[PDB]
UniProtKB/Swiss-Prot annotation, chain A:
Pfam families: HMG-CoA_red. InterPro entries: HMG_CoA_Rdtase, HMG_CoA_Rdtase_bac-typ, HMG_CoA_Rdtase_cat_sf, HMG_CoA_Rdtase_CS, HMG_CoA_Rdtase_NAD(P)-bd_sf, HMG_CoA_Rdtase_sub-bd_dom_sf. The gene is mvaA. This is 3-hydroxy-3-methylglutaryl-coenzyme A reductase. It catalyses: (R)-mevalonate + 2 NAD(+) + CoA = (3S)-3-hydroxy-3-methylglutaryl-CoA + 2 NADH + 2 H(+). Pathway: Metabolic intermediate metabolism; (R)-mevalonate degradation; (S)-3-hydroxy-3-methylglutaryl-CoA from (R)-mevalonate: step 1/1. Homotetramer.
UniProtKB/Swiss-Prot annotation, chain B:
Its EC number is 1.1.1.88. P.mevalonii can use mevalonate as sole carbon source. With this enzyme mevalonate is deacetylated to HMG-CoA. This is 3-hydroxy-3-methylglutaryl-coenzyme A reductase. Pfam families: HMG-CoA_red (PF00368). SUPFAM superfamilies: NAD-binding domain of HMG-CoA reductase, Substrate-binding domain of HMG-CoA reductase. The keyword Oxidoreductase applies. It comes from Pseudomonas mevalonii. GO terms for biological process: coenzyme A metabolic process. Keywords: NAD, Oxidoreductase.
Length: 375, 372
C-alpha cells in the first residue's frame, strides 16, 4: 500500500527484495524466484522459442513512488540502460504531491484485417459486407462463446477500400474485437479466418491476408501528471523557468521529427521494461506507439505538455497499449506471473494504464534533466 | 564456418550448445556461460540499472543458415515469442541457394542536436554558424582525440530552422559524427556540450537541448535477398502465384498504415532479439526504424518486394541501424560479449548489416506464411 520505498536506492538487492517481500506480503517461494538465478526452467525456455541453447538475463528492478488514481503501486522493470528506473521513480515522487497519476483507457479493442482482392467492384462489395455486418459479426462470435460470457467478442465491422494500387483494387475489412485480458492476436486472427469464407461469398473476391493489425488505435491508455513550479526549482533555475524550458522542449519535439524520435524513445524507455517484465510482446507495443505518433501525417510527440491556468506543468500521454495478463510468456514465465503479482493488476487495461503513467513519468524526467542542465 | 546446423531444431539445448561450441571452437569457460544459469552477476546487474532486486531471463537461441556476403554466420537471438527463430532460419536457408544475403552500410554517422533559442534572427544566425562550420567542427574534434585517431570524429555540421513555433523561433544545429564502433550517444552528446558555448557566442542566443537524435538516418544498413519460384510452390500453391501474392501483400503494406505497422513489427521481431543478445539498446533501434518508415509523411513499409526480370522474387531492407560493439551492456554483460563472439563481427556496421538481413528474412517468412 505504500510505494515510497525510502532508502530503497541504497539497499542491497537482497535487502530490497526482502523489503518488497514484506509490504506486499510475498510468499516465501515467491522471494526465492528473485533470490536465486534460473527462475526460467530450460524446459520452459526450450518450449517458448526455437533453437534454444540457453537463457539470457537482464536486471529486474522496481520503480518506487508510483500512484495510480490515488492508489500506490510498485512497478517491475527489466532493462539494461541506466537512469531509467531512477528518473521514473523521482518523477513519480514529484507526482504524488499533486495527486500522483490519473489514468483511464478504452475497452480492450483490437482489429483483425481481412484483405480481399479480385473484386472489380470493391466499392460495391464494401456495401454488401456492411449490409450483412450483423451476420458476419455473429459468425465470428459463435467461435468463442467463453469470451462473450467473459464480456468480450466481436463488436463491429469497418470496411476500407484502396481501388487504385499497382497490384490492383483492394478491399479491407476490419473486425473490431474486445479481447478482455489477452493481447488479442490469436483471438482476433482466429475470428478473421472464421469469417473469411463468408466474406468471399458476399464479395465474390478472395481473401488474401487474415491477421491482426498492430496499429491498435482503438485500445488507448491515458495518463495525466501535474508538477508545480516549487517542485522544479533547481540551484540555478527558477521552477517557473524550468517549466517554460520544458515547454520549449516539447514544442521542439512537436515540430522536428529528429527530436520527436528521440523524445518518444524516452517514453518507450519507461514502457518497454514493464512489458518485458510481464512477459508481453514489446515489438507490438513499439510498432503501435510509433505508427500512432505519425498519424497526423507528421511524425510527432506522443505526449503533450502545457502550463495550466494555475501556472502548473501538466503533461499527457494517450497511446495504443495492447497488452495481456494471460497469453504466451505472460503465463509460462514464473517472473512474469510474479511481476503481475507485484503490480496487483486485475485486468489487462489496468496494466496498460500503469504503462502510460510510467512512460509519461520517464518523458518528464528526461525533459526536466535536459531543461535543467547548464551551459 | 558452415551454419547449416542440421537437425539442430531437434537437439536438446545441451546438444545444441555443444554443437555451437565445436563448430566455433569455444572454450569450456564460454560454454559454461550458457550451460548454467546466472551468467549475469548481481553486482554486475546491480551496477547496470537502479533499484535492482534480481534478474529476469529470456531464451537465448541461435538462428541457422544465415549467409552474409558469401560467408556463413550463426545468429544469437533473445525473445519470448515462438516462430521467429524458425522462420528466420528457414528463409535464410532458401536464401543460400541464390547466394544468401548481400549487405552493405554507410559509415557509422550519428547526429547530435544543438537547439538554440532566444534570438530574433534565426535565419541569419544559421549563416553565421555555417560561416564558422570548420571552427565548430575542430573544437568538437578535440573533446575526443582518441575517436579521431581510430578513424572517426565530427565530419560536418547541418543547421535547420523553425521560424514560427508556438514557443517562438528555433535554430537547430546538427553535429555529424562518425562514432566507429559505439552506438554513439555519449560520444555525440559530449561533443554537443563542447560546442554549445561557442554556438551561443556566434548566434547570441542560448542553447536549450544538446543531445543525440535517435533518427539515425545517416547510419543506414542494407540487405538484399532473392527467392526463385521453385523454392516457393507448396502442395497447394504454385511458386509464381506465391510470388504474386507476396507482391499483393507488400502493396497492401505500402498503402495501408494498419498493415504497415504490422508488416514492420514482423521486421523488428527479427531485429530486436539480436539487439538484446548483444546488449544493445532496442528502444533506439525501434524508434529510428519506425520514424524512418514514415519519413515521406506516410507511415509505410521499411522493406520492398519486387519480381525481377527472370521472375525471381527480390526484397530489400534499408534502414537506420545504430548499434555498438563497445558501450554500456555490450561490454559488461558476459553473454553480450559471447554473442559478439558467436557472430564474429569486427565492426559495429558489420553487426548492423547482419541485423537487417535477419529483419529482411523475418519479413519474408511472415509473408510467405500468410500467402501460403
Amino acid at each position: 500500500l505504500d510505494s515510497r520505498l525510502p532508502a530503497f536506492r541504497n539497499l542491497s538487492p537482497a535487502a530490497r527484495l526482502d523489503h518488497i517481500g514484506q509490504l506486499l506480503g510475498l510468499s516465501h517461494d515467491d522471494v526465492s524466484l528473485l533470490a536465486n538465478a534460473g527462475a526460467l526452467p530450460m524446459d520452459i525456455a526450450n518450449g517458448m522459442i526455437e533453437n534454444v541453447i540457453g537463457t539470457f538475463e537482464l536486471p529486474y528492478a522496481v520503480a518506487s513512488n508510483f500512484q495510480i488514481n490515488g492508489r500506490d503501486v510498485l512497478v517491475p522493470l527489466v532493462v539494461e540502460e541506466p537512469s531509467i528506473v531512477a528518473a521514473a521513480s523521482y518523477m513519480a515522487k514529484l507526482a504524488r504531491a499533486n495527486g500522483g497519476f490519473t489514468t483511464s483507457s478504452s475497452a480492450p479493442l483490437m482489429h483483425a484485417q481481412v484483405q480481399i482482392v479480385g473484386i472489380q467492384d470493391p466499392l460495391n462489395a464494401r456495401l454488401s459486407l456492411l449490409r450483412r455486418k450483423d451476420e458476419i459479426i455473429e459468425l465470428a462470435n459463435r467461435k468463442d462463446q467463453l469470451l462473450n460470457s467473459l464480456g468480450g467478442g466481436c463488436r463491429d465491422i469497418e470496411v476500407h477500400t484502396f481501388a487504385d494500387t499497382p497490384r490492383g483494387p483492394m478491399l479491407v475489412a476490419h473486425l473490431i474485437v474486445d479481447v478482455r485480458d489477452a493481447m488479442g492476436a490469436n483471438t482476433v486472427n482466429t475470428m478473421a479466418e472464421a469469417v473469411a469464407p463468408l466474406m468471399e461469398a458476399i464479395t465474390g473476391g478472395q481473401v488474401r491476408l487474415r491477421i491482426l493489425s498492430n496499429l491498435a488505435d482503438l485500445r488507448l491508455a491515458r495518463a495525466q501528471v501535474r508538477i508545480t513550479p516549487q517542485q522544479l526549482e533547481t540551484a540555478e533555475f527558477s521552477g517557473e523557468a524550468v517549466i517554460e524550458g520544458i515547454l520549449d522542449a516539447y514544442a521542439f519535439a512537436a515540430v522536428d521529427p529528429y527530436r520527436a524520435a528521440t523524445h518518444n524513445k524516452g517514453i518507450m524507455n519507461g514502457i518497454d521494461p514493464l512489458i518485458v517484465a510481464t512477459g508481453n510482446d514489446w515489438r507490438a507495443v513499439e510498432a503501435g506507439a510509433h505508427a500512432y505518433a505519425c498519424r497526423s501525417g507528421h511524425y510527432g510527440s506522443l505526449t503533450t505538455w502545457e502550463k495550466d491556468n494555475n501556472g502548473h506543468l501538466v503533461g499527457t500521454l494517450e497511446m495504443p497499449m495492447p497488452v495481456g495478463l494471460v497469453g504466451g510468456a505472460t503465463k509460462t514465465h514464473p517472473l512474469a506471473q510474479l511481476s503481475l503479482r507485484i503490480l496487483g493488476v486485475k485486468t489487462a487495461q489496468a496494466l496498460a494504464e500503469i504503462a502510460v503513467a510510467v512512460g509519461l513519468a520517464q518523458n518528464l524526467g528526461a525533459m526536466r534533466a535536459l531543461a535543467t542542465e547548464g551551459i
